[PDB]
Every structure is written in C-alpha cells, then in structure tokens.
Amino acid sequence: ANRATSAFLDNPHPVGVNYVDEGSRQFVAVAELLASKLIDSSRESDESNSDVPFVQAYSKFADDNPRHLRVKTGGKMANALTNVIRSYYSINAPAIVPQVEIDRLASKATVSGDMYNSYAIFNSVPIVEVLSPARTTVSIVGSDRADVTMLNTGAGAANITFNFGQIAETVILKGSVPFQLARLNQPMPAARFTYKLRPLDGPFIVVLPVGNPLVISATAATRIQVPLAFNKALVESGFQTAMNDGLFDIQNVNYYSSFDEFIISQYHAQDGINRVSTCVILGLALQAYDQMRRALPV
Amino acid sequence: ANRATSAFLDNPHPVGVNYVDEGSRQFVAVAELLASKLIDSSRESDESNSDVPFVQAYSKFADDNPRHLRVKTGGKMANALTNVIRSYYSINAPAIVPQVEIDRLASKATVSGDMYNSYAIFNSVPIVEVLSPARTTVSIVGSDRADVTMLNTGAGAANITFNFGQIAETVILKGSVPFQLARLNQPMPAARFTYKLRPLDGPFIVVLPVGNPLVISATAATRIQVPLAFNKALVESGFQTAMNDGLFDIQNVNYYSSFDEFIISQYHAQDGINRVSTCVILGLALQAYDQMRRALPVR
Amino acid sequence: VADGTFNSMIMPRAVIANEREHFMKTRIDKIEHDLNRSAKQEMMDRQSLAEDYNALNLAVGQEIKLDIATQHQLNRLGSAMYKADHERETELTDLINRIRENEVTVNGILENQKAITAAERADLLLEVVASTAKSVSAAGRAAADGSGVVPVFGPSVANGIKVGIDIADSVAEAAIAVKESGIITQLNDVYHAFQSVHVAPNDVIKPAAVVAGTSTELIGNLQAIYSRLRSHSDIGFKKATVGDVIPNSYMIKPVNSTEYASWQLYVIHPVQGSLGLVVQLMGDALTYNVFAQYGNTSASEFGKTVLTGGATNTALEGTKVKFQTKVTAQQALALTMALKDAASMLSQGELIGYFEQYINLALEPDNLSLQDNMHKYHHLLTSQNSPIDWNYHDEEMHKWLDSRKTTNYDAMQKKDGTVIADIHIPKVFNDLRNTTLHCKLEGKQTIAGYTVYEYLIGPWAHYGDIDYSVVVDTLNEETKWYCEVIGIDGHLLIEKSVQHKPEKILELTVNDSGVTSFNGRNHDRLKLKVYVKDSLSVKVFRNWIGINAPRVKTKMFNDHIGVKYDYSHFDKNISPAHLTLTDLGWHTWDQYNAGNWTNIK
C-alpha cells in the first residue's frame, strides 16, 4: 500500500519551555493591552494634528519620553517582547531576558493572565494518513482547503481509507463528482456530493470507481482555548512580520505558512496539549508584536 | 455532451419560515448589541480591579446576577438565541420559543430591526453548468476560488460553454496559459490571460486547443443586502461554532463549508429572493452567538 | 347522502407499485400469448417455413436462412408484429368504408351533437355506420379481439433457446453448424424487455371525432393517426435488429414511503417510437419531460429533451420497479397533459391510479372531463399543429439505428470472423415493412366449398419493386386454387394448381409518393383474396427486389385529404365453383352484370 500525508503535519519541532509561569503570562497580556492603546493613540494623534496623545502612550509603553533624534524602538518592553517570541518558537533559542525584567514590566497594568477563558476556531485540515491500494495515485494539496486527487487505473473499484486524526471537531468533504463514503464496516450509501464527519468516529472508506479522476475538497474546524483578547486577524499578521523580521531563524526548526498550521501541527504531536498551551501564549505575543511594530516601524 | 456543476450549489434545503417578523428581527439585533457589550465589559473588568462592569452587563443579558460556583450560561436570552438559530437553518427544526418571550427580550435594548440598511460582498463563485463535448474532460474544484481543469484528447479544438448564472455581478477568469473566450455568436478575440465578465451577458464559449490541459481560475463578487451591524469575520466564526455545537444537526439538510456558500446556494434556488432574507437574519444571529459564547464558554 | 364506502370501492388502483398487482397482470399476458401462439407449434413449423423462404428465388446477400437461430427468432417476432399491424389496417379500411356509405348521417352527427362526450359521440357513429364492433369500452375491445391482434410477449418467445455457444479458433464446417444453432446473450436480453402494442380503430375514433365536423375530416384523421402508428411499429422491429440492448421502462418509488410525503417517478421507454416520457408526481404537482431516444452518446439513457413541462429529477434514490407499457408515447403524453391541467380537482390516489392504469392496462380514466381533455390533446399531438414535429424524430431515429447497426457489425468483424458476425447480426432484417416476411392468413368464409383468405396489399412506407407470393397447403392431392386482386376499375382473376410451394402472383412498382399504377390507375392499396378447397394453411410472402428499400415520407392530414381513393370494391367476392375459362382474366366492372362478379355477361 501507499500512504500520503499533509505536508505541514510532518516533524513538528519542540517549542520553548521557559516563559510559561504566572508572571510571564501577565507580561504578555500587559504588552497586548499597552500596544493596543499605543496604536489607538497614534490614530488619535493623526486626527488631532498633535503629538501629545502619542507621547503619553509611548511613555507608558517604553518607560522613557520619546526624543526626536532617537529612533523610537519601543524601549525595554519592545526588546523583551522580541526575545520571548524567539524563545517560544524553539527549545534551542536561549532565554536572555531576566525574570526581574519580566516582573517589572508586568506591573505596568493590572490584567489577568488567564489564557484559557475563551476559544478560537482554526481552519487547518489535518490529514494524518491516506492509504491507497496498488495502481492508484493519490496527491494531497492544500492546508486551509485540502484537495485530494485520486486516479484509479486498476481493473475494479478501489477502497481508499482516510484518517483525519482525533483532534479536529468537524470535517466537511465536497467532491467534484458524487461519491460514496462510510466508516469501517458500515453500509455504503448512495452517491452524494457533500459529507459532514466527526473525526473521532474512525477511519473513513471512499470507494473509487474506475474512470475519470475524483477530487475531494476537505475543510476542517478545531477549537483551541485562548485568552479573550485573542484576535486571529492580528495574530496572522504578526506571524508574517516575525517570520520576515528573522525572529524564527534557528537551526533544526520547521517553518509554516500560517499560524493556523503551526498550532494544529504542534497539536498532532507528542505532548500536544502542553505544546498548544505554549503556542497560545506565543500567539498573544505575536498580536502585541503586530500592533507595536505598525505603530513604531523600524 | 457532459455537464459539470459546483458541489456547493446542489440541492439547497428549505430554510425556516418562523421568527422572521419585525418583532423577531428586533430580538436578534438586541441580542447582537447586548452580546457585544458583554465582550467589552469583560475586557474592561479584566483590566481593572473591580467586577462591577461585568456584573451589570451579565445581569442585563441573563436577567440574573452572576454567582460563584455557577456555570454562567447566559440565561433565557442564551436559550432563545440558540433555539432561534436552529429554526432558521432548517424547516424541519421545531419552533419552541414563545413569541411573548421573544418580545420581552427585544425590549431590553433599543435598536431598529432593519435587515436591509446596507450591503455585503460574498465571494463564492457560482458555476451553474459547464457543457463540454464528448472527447474532452472537465473537473471543477473549489468554492471561493474555482479551478476548472480542461483536457482535450480529440483531434481538433473543442468549444466548452460556461454558465455562471444571473445572480453574480462580476466574474474574473484567469487562465494558466493564454486562451480565448467570447460570448455566443461573437468573434473570438486574441488569446489573453485574464477576462472580466458580467454573468448576465450570457453563456461564454472558450476554445480548448489540443495539447496540454488548461486550468481556469474564477473569482466572483455578489452583493446581498445586510444590516449595517453585519460583520463577515464574526459571522463566519459563528457559523463554524454552531456546526461544531450541533445546532445544525437535523434530518435532510445539506451542509456547507462556510456561510458564503450557504447564502449563495439559497440565492440561486427558486424563491432565492425570499430565502436570502431569512439567511441574513440567521447571519446576524450567528454574529451574536459568537460574541456571547466567546464571552461565556460552556461545555 | 352516502357512507363513502362505494367511493373507495371504485377508486383507481396502482397497478405498477403494487407487487400483487404486477404479478397478476404479467400472468394474464403470458397466458394470452401462449394460447394464441404456442412455442411447440412454431418450433415444429420451423422446417416448413425454411423451405418456403428458400424456394423463393432470392439473390445472394438478400436471402434469409431460418437454419440460423438469430434469423429464426427475428422472423417469429417479425411475423407476429406484422400480423397484428396488418389486421388493424384491414379493420380501419372496413371502418372507413362504412363511414363513406353513410356520410349524410355521419355529417349530421358530427355537426348537431357537440356537447356530448367523446365516448358518446363514437358510440353514436359506430351504431349509425353499423360496424362489426360497436363497443368503445375497454371490456368491449377486449371481448371483440382477434387471435392475431394479441400483443407479443417477450420472455415467451425467448424461452428455452440456447445461449452462449463457445467454439475456439475453429473454421470447420461442423463447428460453424453448432455455432449457428445458438444465439447471443444480447438478443436474449432484448427479447426479455420487448412487448408490442397495437391500437384498435375503435380506440382511435375517439380522438379522430372529437373536433371533426365533416366525414372527410374524420376519415382523414383516422388515416393520419394510423400512419404514425405503423411508422412507430417499424422502428420497434429495427431496434431489436441492431446489436444493442434496448432500454425498458421502470418506476422509482421511495425505499420507505411516508404517508404524507411520497413521490413517484415514471420513465416510459416505448419500444415502438422515437421519443420517451419522464413523469414525476410530487405532492399534487405533475411534471413531464419528453426526450429523444436517439443520440445518448453519454452513459445516461435520456437524449436531448424535445418538450418540457417542468423539472424532472431522474437521479432520485429509491426502489426500482420495472414494467412494459401498453400505450404509445402519444397516448401517454395525452394523459399527462390532461392530468396536469386537472391536478387541482383530483386527489393523490386518483392521479397515481389513473396514470398507472392507462400505462399498464390501456384503461381510460372514468372521469368524463379527464377523458374529453385527453382525447383533445391526443388529436393535437397527431395533427399538423402538434408541438412535436414527428417526421423529424422518426427520420432521426432511422439514421441513428442504421449507424448503430454498422458500428456494431464492424466492431464484431474485428473481434471475430466475418461469418461469426453475419450469423449474429444479419443485414437482411432491417425494417418491418422492408424485410421479407410471411402472413399466415386465416379464413372463416366458405363459398360453395371454397375457403376465402383475405389479404391487404399495402399501404407502402417504402418505394421500389415489390413481389408477392402464396403458399397453399391442401389435404387433397390435386386442387385448383384461385387468386383475385381487386382494385377500383376492376379485379384480376388467376388460376393455379401447384401446391406446397411459393408462387409469385403480383409484380408491383411503387414510386416516391407510395402510390402504384395498377392497370392504368393510381392505387394506394389493393385487396388479395385466395380461394381454396379444404385448405390447411395459406401464407402470403412479400419481398423487395433490392435490400433495404428507401423510405417513403409519412403522410399527414393534408396529404390524406388531397388524394381520395375508393375502397368500396374490396367487399365483393367471387364464386370459383361457378367460374368459366372466359371469365378468367383482368376485367372491369362495366363488363359484369349488377351483383354477379363471377360471370362476364
């Protein structure tokens, strides 16, 4: 038999284990709150044609009054935020921020470090394995929308078994032409365009008739506990900025096209629950990084 | 001649016919307004040293004071919103919420029930039918971006007809290699990469040369009237949550990967003008559901 | 007031969905076929027919050998279909004659009485013309039905015939002989899905006289309807000829039907016709689609749609129940139009029951308004203002079938030898009226010890040269049998004495219009009468000089009105026991005295 896998689920590198205490989670939450206020002040500064609102926001964030000759990097908070993002990604990235610096920056605002009081839906579709018989070709393309192309060159119909993992909550399959799908040892139903499946049910068998190729489009949705301040649009923008700014350039690390792939791949791995906990904190850090960098380009 | 169709456009199931009056529209708008305030109140209380803003917001929403050692479900408004969502999706779902309860909840806040204040743009590309000769094969894949792979195994060039319906306003066709496309009874232009089409112009004929396969990528834009409070990002997120929570689990109903596909499919069926009105109200309800459940998660 | 019990007792019943109602019907048709045609008799008479065909001098490539299994099976199917069709034409010609005799009373009936139903008008017309059959009800038609008009039963003909004879890489004479004895699996499947339909002139007079106001219009409508029926029957025989498996009708019903949400789908595939019908019943709404049986280049059986009446979903999922229709496509379309118009004032049970009964048992609905609308639509579909252009579709069906025959034979000629392909797909069995065939005449008239066997010469749907011959078997060792051919100007008497051998009587040429010149006058049909003492069997053979004679265009209403031919002379007889030598030849009516067509006088 031949097995096929989604590209992004292969070999997830270990995540960092350093800044996960109660104080560190408070610092990340404080950075998100203060960076959001900074970007709001910059908009207000432009509207009112005065730099006074921005100066107040920058002083709170950077612990220093902005100076025209200086470059406005963000102060100690920006440097600390950049280093924790590096440490969160990989276990080989050193932790260079002292704990006394984290505690001092955590006291700038009063916020709870509760990272598990809300939820967010992630759209990366996990295809753990697709097993096909001989004389059949199966190709998997896509992460947000997985298209599986199957061609049958054998004498008779083939049975292709899909395994979507045990983590995803729902999966919706739509085919180019009607096809029949069922679980292990259930009667095959009539040809039908769209199927809705719960991945916990078990492996699913697709009967592939001989002839024109059949393409199945796969869309999934999984629920991950996140803080209430989480915003997926900001996290995705922050992920690209950090990747472009060379914050994830560490040896023996795997790269991903989106933060959705990173958290899902890290979830279909050994110690998935603990890995996801660190990934959520990284996402909130990237949310603060996106806001702070757009207000203070460098 | 073979026919090819979009997967999401088939067999649209009937949508609910209850809770679509003016009083019911006010309830959904009130629920959306009160759900948003709940989110901002929780953020405000988290950033402060007092829980008073959250206590007032939850008491207004749930009609009971929050309590320790309690699940913080959401109260009667949460139950009404959940059952109302079930009714809109399918006509087989029961309508159990009394109208008196809906009217009582709609009096909590003051908002208009306008569902036609503004417009929104939905990106699902409707390919109603692709008609190809006997020698060729055509495969349609995708909903937001439709890729049609076209292979000509015959001796000469083939002509394939594209029909995008009459609902969509613009469709942009982009090919892997330059190709030719023109209307019925019109001369073929020079081979060019991209085409802009108005679907009302008529069926479109594309010349398929013999050789390597030709893939055409299609993107379309459609305008559907929505209330001003409509937010596409929140609606789509709420759509996935309701499907995960089983609010759409009922007999003889089709399933869709996104709210964009759902509304476009109902638009293209008979009585589509009447069906989209109910779908828009369900969209605003899903917006309230996302805010309310993210503020008060339950198992 | 009533309790409501009698209403439920007269409600129509579903005769397709009910498995009890399908088993009972199939038995009766099988019993009816076996009684009139016996497998033992036909198989035993195979040798006699084979020698008769060979004794006819047919050039090479234009002769049939019933020693071949496929050729024999095709012939019995052809003879049964032709005999039933031929009998209907004689009945129609007689009916036209009675109407022309009483044109004055018929004209008064057609004009004065118009508020009565179609059935009532037909009954009054039949009584006035004093026809042999005076009943228009279903029971009366069944009671007054000849032996030959019984529809042929598919499985009965195909029962107990060897299928799938395997010889490997052998060209020996003995291997060829054993190969010819068997039949291919495709022909067995075709025969298992074949049933014929032959409508009676009494059933046709209701559509013909529903809007007619003159006797000429009524006669012309009758002729126009029967021209379409004969063309459809010719298509039916050609369908089994080519190497293709014919589709057969089926009904789709829900796997677990609900009390209040039930739907029915009917797919009619008339073997005698160029078009099919798809009917869907969802709720109280009826939707129909008329498709073309030709084309179908794809896997789907349905071709292009030529008439639309809604949206019909043929991809529904449910149980499949199979049946054979006893009505033509025109009749099925006529009812589905009337049901669609009257869907509001009929219940679900009436809609299903009326439709199933007509398709399966040729039973007209008991509703008077439904029946009147049905026959009004039947007249429209067979007139010149029909929504369907028939001549186009029958022509296209002919071209499609000949194309399939060529590609099926050429596909086989590659896979096996030419001889193997020839015995499996004959080229001499093209069309029902094109082929060489025989008619086993029956006789119930005896004039002075001479049994009279009547035969209708024509009408012709093909043009060229035709030959007619008789084979007479008589218990006596020596006899003298006479053949008389009657036209308009006069009749032609010939005398023969040869027995147990075919003998050519008439050489005829027919032009593009389908009209022959019989002794200086244009004729469209002739009558052949054979007189024999103590005869046992008389068979009439017909053949065309060239194989696959070209077609003649089907005649519509205006074609029949333009040319009028007298048929009153077909009634008179002669007495061979009182014949003389001088009376034997071609003579006209002015020679004979009034009432004695035997002696010149």
Next chain:
Amino acid sequence: AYSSGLSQNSIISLTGNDRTVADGTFNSMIMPRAVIANEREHFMKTRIDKIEHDLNRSAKQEMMDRQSLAEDYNALNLAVGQEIKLDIATQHQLNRLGSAMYKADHERETELTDLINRIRENEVTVNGILENQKAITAAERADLLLEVVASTAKSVSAAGRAAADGSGVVPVFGPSVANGIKVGIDIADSVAEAAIAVKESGIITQLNDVYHAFQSVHVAPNDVIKPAAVVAGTSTELIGNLQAIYSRLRSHSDIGFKKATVGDVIPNSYMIKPVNSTEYASWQLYVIHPVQGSLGLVVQLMGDALTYNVFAQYGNTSASEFGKTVLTGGATNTALEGTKVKFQTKVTAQQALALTMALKDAASMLSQGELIGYFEQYINLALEPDNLSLQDNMHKYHHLLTSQNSPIDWNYHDEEMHKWLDSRKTTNYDAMQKKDGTVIADIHIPKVFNDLRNTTLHCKLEGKQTIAGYTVYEYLIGPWAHYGDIDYSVVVDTLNEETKWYCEVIGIDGHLLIEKSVQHKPEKILELTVNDSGVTSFNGRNHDRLKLKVYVKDSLSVKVFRNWIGINAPRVKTKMFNDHIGVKYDYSHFDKNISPAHLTLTDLGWHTWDQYNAGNWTNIKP
C-alpha cells in the same frame, strides 16, 4: 419459546407510528392484501391455475397418449414383479401425477447445473462481489450476481420469474387431472374376467379425494440463490448452499408422491376466521399441511401477537391430524370456532417457517394488516414481501433452517416419515386383502409405486436447438437418491419411414457417441450402478450426474424411460452442505455439442477430450 438470537434488521412500517394507514394515500394503495380470506381473490386464483394447467397439459391429449405410453411401458421387459400396466385406471392416474411432477423437478435441476456452471466460469468476479459488498440486502447482492454471470432469467422479482417460466415447470393442478374418471364401480363378488376388466376401469373414492387436494411446489434457482448469499464467504460456499437447498427439496418431492400411493387421504391446509369479524378484535388461524414435506405449520394471529407451532406429519393416527410438536413458538389454539376456508400452499415448509420467524421478530414494528397480507401473499401466491428489510430478514432465517446448525434437523424427520409411509402401505394392503381379496387390492394399491425416483417413470423432452437439421433433446442423468442398478431407455418417433438418430453422453472427461435406428419402440441406451454415496463410476471416474443428448430428424417426440432393477431401492442419506464442499466435480463440459450431419463412421464410441482439438467436439483428430 425459541430464541434464535439471529441478528435482524429494523423494519420501517408503511402504516407509521399510529399503526394504521391514512385513507387515500400512496401507502394504502401499495399495502399487501389478503388473498385467502377474500373470496373474490381466492375464487380467481383458482381459475388462473386451472387455465395455466390446461394450457400446458391437455386432458384430451393425455387420454389419447395413454395407449402409446402403455405399449412403450410393456416393451420395457421388466420383471414379473415390477411390471407397470397402464390399462389399470389407478396405475394410469399415478403415472400422470408422477410424470408431470418429475418433469418439473427435472427441469429445476437442469437450471441449477447451468447456474453452477456459470458461477464457476466467473469465479474471480463472483468472489469480488461476495467479500466487498458484505453490507447489502440479499436481493441487491443477488441482482449483482445474476448480472455478472450473464445467465438467462436475470430478473429476480416475482413478475420476472413468472414471465421467464417454462411450460413444464407449471405446478400440477390436482382437480384437473381427476376429471371425468369413473369412481366406485362394484362387481358383487364376481371373479370372472369380464367383471375384473370392469373393476380395473375405475378408481376408488379415496384416490379421487387425494387428487382434489394435491398441488405441487417447484422452487426456481433464482429464488434459491437469495438465501445462499446471505452468508457466503467464497464462491465454493455459495455453490455448496445451492446444493444443500435443492437436495432437501428433492427429498421432499419424493415424500409428496409417496403420500398419494400409500393408501390414505392427505389432509387439507385451511384457515379459520371468525363468523362475524369485529374491528380490533379479529383473530386468524392458519394450518399448513405441505404435501411435499415431512413437517407442518400452525400459525395463529391474535391481535398484535403471532404464535406458531411446527408439528410432525407422521404418527398422527389417534383422532387428530397433528403429531408431536417439534418446535414451539408459543401457544396455538386449533379448537377456535369460525368459518373454515381451504387453500393450497405454493411454498415449502421451510419457506413458510422462515417467514413466520421474521414476522414474529417484527410484529411490533409492523401492523396487524401487514402481518396478515404478507403471510397470505407468500403462502398462497409465493409472493415475497415488498418490505425489503423484512424480505432480507426472511432469507436469513431461511439459511439457518437449511444449514447444519438449524434448530430442527431434517434427515431424522425425513427418515421417520418414510418409515411411517411404507408401514401404512402394508397396513392398507393387508386390510384390503382381507376385506375384498388380493386381485382387487392389487388393483387399488399398486406395489410398484413407491417414490418419485424409485418408480419407473417417463419424461418427455422438448427440443428447440437444431444443428444442421438435427433437433437436440437434453436429459440430465442423475443425481440419485438411491443406490443399486438403473437403466435408461430412449424412444424416438419421427415422420420419416427410415431414421438415423444418435445419442451422446457427456462425462467429466470425454463423451460417448452412439447410434441407433429403432423407432416407435423403446431402445436401451445406458446402464449404471451407483454406490452407497450416490456416486457412479463412469469409464473410470467418479460422477454424480451425467448429461444425455438425443439428436433426431423431423422428430415429434422423444421420451426417456428410467427404471431400477430391484423394486424399492434403498435411500442414500440426504446430502448436506459439508459433504457437498468436501468433494468437487465439474459440469462445464455439459454444454458441448456435436454435429450428426458431419459425423463419420470412425468418430463413434467413447473418446476423451484430448483426442479432439480446441472446439469441434464431433470430428476426430487425424
């Protein structure tokens, strides 16, 4: 009180949760009807069977053909103790039922061999169907099977089976063959030859009563294939289940004929219904006495409860028609008071028992009217229930009752029923010998008639295949339910004065070609000796059945006479599924033919296959 434990699919009723159909709906139009209780339906269903019988078999033809048949039987030089004389009225009547009954059973076996032959040819694809389509209904699984084997009679529905039915397989109608026969003439203690001739012209009143309550049941292979495929891992197991079913059917057919010749009246199957039925208070009772069976069934319907009892048909010699109950499904009251309606069953005991097990397990889901209609339609019309889930359930129970692990065993009951029958033949003969004498007793209770296969019976053959002018008549030699020595004779009658007719016997390896020219008289063709296992050694190989083909010119009829050397040959133990898969034979060569027109002098005799080339099984390789 029997718990099978078999898995059964859930049944969805047409009536709904209310358990009553809505007036004027599609469901009420397709509901099953009661063909037995309604007089209009039952009075009709008699008429169609009578028409079917008289169409295929004519009484006038059978009366005329009596003289020629007697001459042919006489020309078969049997021993003085085994002579069959057709001038005796009783013997002629028993021959008519025997010949018609055997012909139908012989035709069924011929079709079974062809279906087995077709299955083995496509063994690779048949295996693919069985394993892959594990989860599917029996009817759907079968429909795929007959489609891929490319066999005749593809349709599996009742209408299709009726349409593609031969003239010889029509069930025998008892009352028709008992018409116009003189019964009850008296000689008044006269022993003169003239008086004896009169006595032989008539029959006794008992035989007339037996004939008026007789109806044969013959099971088509296409119906048999459904219960075989419900559990079929491989194609070999499918073949074995086919043989197990038909061997049991042949055993029951012989028992049915023996009941007519024993000397006792066969009880009638009947139904008891209330004098004035009250809505929601009605009860139905059915008693089935299958003439072709060793067991009976009593089914009672009281409200929503179904109760059945399977009783032995032997040993009920004490003021009752029911023996001991071999299988109990509840309590059945046969003393119920009501009107008495008689019917003749068209299904075997196992089939009727199979349906009543499924009905009991689905009584709650189905309505009372559905239970009545489905039962009556199957029992009286052989119409399978329309409910696909119920139909699939019944075939699962059919397989269990036929397989080795059946709750009731049939070898034991068939053996006892045989012992009971021949014991009653001795008692009836001994009593009649005392009362009226040996000469009269021999007239009314012949000794030669024992069983369908034991008795010397003739089987007319119909031929439709013509090879270069030679009509082909096929007769299947075997299988046998007895061991001993058997003989086969072929009678040929043609229109020509001089004839040249050939015969051919196909074995596993090679075939034997012979030529004979004697016509209008029996001609002895082949001799066999079969051992205790029913297996015969033919030219050095073990066979269970052989193929016989007669080639003739301008033939009118061909008859095959079979007889055993010793009267009342012993019975081989009935074969089962395990012993059918234990040894494997081949019947693929039975389709091979020869061309007598091209036969030469040197090709006659016994020639193996390798002496010929590929094809051309008529001329010898030089």
